[PDB]
Amino acid sequence: CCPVNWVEHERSCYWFSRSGKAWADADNYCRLEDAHLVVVTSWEEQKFVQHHIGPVNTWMGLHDQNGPWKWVDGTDYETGFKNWRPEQPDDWYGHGLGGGEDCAHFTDDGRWNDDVCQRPYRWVCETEL
Ligand SMILES: [Ca+2]
Ligand SMILES: [Ca+2]
Ligand SMILES: [Ca+2]
C-alpha cells in the first residue's frame, strides 16, 4: 500500500510536491521519505507523471553530477528511456551562474532539460511497492 497523499501507478507510489527546492534538497527530501526522486523508464510512466505535474518545471532523479548521466536508484541511463527536448542535454554555461547544467527536469511540455542544480523547482518522489 502507498502512504496517504501518494498516488499509486503500476506498482509504484508517487508524491508530487507543490513547493520548490534545489535538486540536492529535493533528493534529500525523497530519501527521508524512504523514497527517491522519480526515475522514468517508459512512455507510460512519462505520460502518468506529466498528467500530475502539469506545465511546471519539475526535478526528476537524473543527474550528471561528477560523472556520466545516472538515475538516482542505479537504473542504467544509456540503455533506458529518454525524453530530452531536441538539442538537450547541452550542459549550458551561458546562464552565467558558474558551471554547466547537471540536473534533469521535466519542462512545461514534459520533455526533459538539463539545468543548474541550484534552481528551485517542484519535484516528484517515487517508491516501489
Ligand atoms: Ca519509475
Ligand atoms: Ca552536465
Ligand atoms: Ca539545458
Numbering used by the authors: 152 to 280
Question: What does the original paper state about this entry?
Answer:
Herein, bifunctional probes have been developed that target the hepatocyte‐specific asialoglycoprotein receptor (ASGPR), the expression of which decreases during NASH progression. To analyze how the probes, bind to the potential NASH biomarker, X‐ray crystallography and saturation transfer difference nuclear magnetic resonance (STD NMR) spectroscopic methods were used.
